[PDB]
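Exercise 4. Each item below gives a protein and its sequence. For each, produce the structure-token representation.

Item: Bis(5'-nucleosyl)-tetraphosphatase [symmetrical] (Escherichia coli K-12).
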Amino acid sequence: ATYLIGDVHGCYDELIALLHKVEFTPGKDTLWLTGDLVARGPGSLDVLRYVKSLGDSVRLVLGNHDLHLLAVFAGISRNKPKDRLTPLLEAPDADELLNWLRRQPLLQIDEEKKLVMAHAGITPQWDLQTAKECARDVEAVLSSDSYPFFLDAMYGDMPNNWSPELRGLGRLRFITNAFTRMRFCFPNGQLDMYSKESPEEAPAPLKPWFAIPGPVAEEYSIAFGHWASLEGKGTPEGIYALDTGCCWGGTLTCLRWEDKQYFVQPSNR
Ligand SMILES: [Mn+2]
Ligand SMILES: [Mn+2]
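Answer:
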């Protein structure tokens, strides 16, 4: 079976409880995770140890908090007490865990399922070939010996409009924002990097990225996490918003792909 789970945010107990609910069995089943494995919840260290141990039985995409953790580890960014990352950062296997983490994808595609996963979704300004190329470019910088330079370079809110002519720092920043920070778009598809509210509460003329017809969404189902204020609701057919806010006192959500059956684990918080 194929299971997809939204943002875990260090909620190790809820993750394991949900996987036990569906009798997740590596070798028979595959788990997709939308990223943001770490921060806020108490168990980022246990989450990373477990997910890394799954090997080929898990298909991860990196989220914005995963990248922030990598920036803290590399001395690029300051640790915020609220993130509850110190046990992971101080662990004896931190290097092993974080060098594995930075090598994980930004984008997962299963052609037989016609299923695409990214942390924030797929901007309607991208077709599939472009999304693939952009994921490969950023994955290349993150897996390289010089990844602290990219992590420093990623921070920024501009440019917010895709063009194949984008180059250099702006290109990398857009790619990072599209995969890991996207929520709202302007009518022309340009990213808004400020509004984090639910679709009903956003200022006009902002619309969710998935409300704008895009070439990937016309051919593929898209699963994503990230947007907790969406509460997993309000999406069109073929769009699966899996982040139901577990670390916020919401729930952890698991979707089984074969029958589109949902399983939910209440937050312990
Ligand atoms: Mn998140
Ligand atoms: Mn996120």
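Check: The pocket of manganese (II) ion (ligand 1) is lined by residues 7, 9, 36, 63, 65, 226, 243 (CB under 6 Å).
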